[PDB]
């Protein structure tokens, strides 16, 4: 019966969600719980860099009004 084709599809599927969940949590871990900034245009890289200089060395650390 067709249901036997499912085992194979399942294994494919599980192996196609891993990548999307993986890439989207190894980003939120490396960037400090905040989505990796996407610097499409320089302004953004500038702002990002500015952030680095503002604190520690990493941009993800984010200083606030209390600074």
């Amino acid at each position: 019966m067709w249901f036997e084709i499912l085992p194979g599809l399942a294994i494919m599927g599980v192996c196609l969600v891993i990548p999307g969940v993986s890439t989207a949590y190894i980003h939120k871990f490396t960037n400090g719980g905040k989505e990796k900034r996407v610097a499409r245009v320089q302004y953004q890289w500038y702002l990002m860099e500015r952030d680095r200089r503002i604190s520690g060395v990493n941009r993800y650390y984010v200083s606030k009004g209390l600074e």
Binding site: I11, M12, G13, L16, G20, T23, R40
Partner: protein, 315 residues
């Protein structure tokens, strides 16, 4: 970390790539009143690994040849196909590229060589012709394939595949632009040399695998199937936009999983259902039936934005 994120996004796809052949040799089976492979392993789950080990152990005959193409070519086919998964924006992409779709279009285009190189490398005048069929059709279908994307982009505003997740937050791009989806789907069927458009490996010997056995056979082989997925996945981002919620990124990937599998299932279903087109029948479709439709609908997609005051926001 980034390395781990390279294992994921690769292995997972390779393991899934293996399970597609299985779900191809069973879905084609049940459609043809037969169980398909269930005896090796449970329900045939170990079947893809089994043939892989046989293929690598058999003598790479290396058949008499230009050697460095008998080795370089297979590698290019796997390298480009696995590489094109680098930017796919399943939820977040891995390497977000501002000109992402041009990367995908360019990387696909390079695979036509592997066919050309493999065909010249065998020393069978037959093969030299077989490669010609694929190389010619690939570039041909590429011309409508590219124009169909340019129509899309102009309604997306950018070349970055990440933008479409924000373009398709209210409706799939199938509703609009369905006429091209169909034409993207048929072109995706040609570029993966799948059935309706599989003249290669056709009556030649039912072309560029003729002399390829064991490990070289496998690498292209792997490449084709990974592509089979990738192109289907590009259909599932560009035209069928999976629901995106910024709070939970995986329902995007969960639906990306569901739509990709169904459209991957569709080309499996297409293969069993249709006879293969003639070589000229195939080019007659693209240059006569599709290219005039695509070029005109291309203009409609430069006009729809302007007079409907809908010019898309860059960025």
């Amino acid at each position: 970390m980034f390395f781990i994120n390279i294992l994921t996004l690769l292995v997972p796809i390779l393991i899934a790539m293996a399970f597609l052949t299985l779900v191809e040799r069973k879905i084609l089976g049940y459609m043809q009143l037969r169980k398909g492979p269930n005896i090796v392993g449970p329900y045939g789950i170990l079947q893809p690994f089994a043939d892989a080990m046989k293929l690598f152990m058999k003598e790479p005959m290396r058949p008499t040849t230009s050697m460095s193409l008998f080795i370089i070519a297979p590698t290019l086919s796997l390298t480009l196909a696995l590489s094109l998964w680098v930017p796919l924006p399943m939820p977040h992409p891995l390497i977000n590229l501002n000109l992402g779709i041009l990367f995908i279009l360019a990387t696909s285009s390079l695979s036509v060589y592997s066919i050309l190189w493999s065909g010249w490398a065998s020393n069978s005048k037959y093969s030299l012709f077989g490669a010609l069929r694929a190389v010619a059709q690939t570039i041909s279908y590429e011309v409508t394939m590219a124009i169909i994307l340019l129509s899309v982009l102009l309604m997306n505003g950018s070349y970055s595949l990440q933008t479409l997740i924000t373009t398709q937050e209210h409706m799939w791009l199938l509703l609009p632009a369905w006429p091209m989806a169909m034409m993207w789907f048929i072109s995706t069927l040609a570029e993966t040399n799948r059935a309706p458009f599989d003249l290669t490996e056709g009556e030649s010997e039912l072309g560029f695998n003729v002399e390829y056995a064991a490990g070289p056979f496998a690498l292209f082989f792997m490449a084709e199937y990974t592509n089979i997925i990738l192109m289907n996945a590009l259909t599932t981002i560009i035209f069928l936009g999976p629901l995106y919620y910024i709070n939970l990124p995986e329902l995007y990937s969960t639906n990306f999983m569901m739509e990709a599998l169904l459209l991957s299932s569709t080309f499996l279903w297409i293969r069993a259902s249709y006879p293969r087109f003639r070589y000229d029948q195939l080019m007659h479709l693209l240059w006569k039936n599709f290219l005039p439709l695509t070029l005109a609908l291309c203009m409609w997609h430069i006009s729809l934005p302007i007079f409907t005051a809908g010019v898309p926001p860059y960025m």
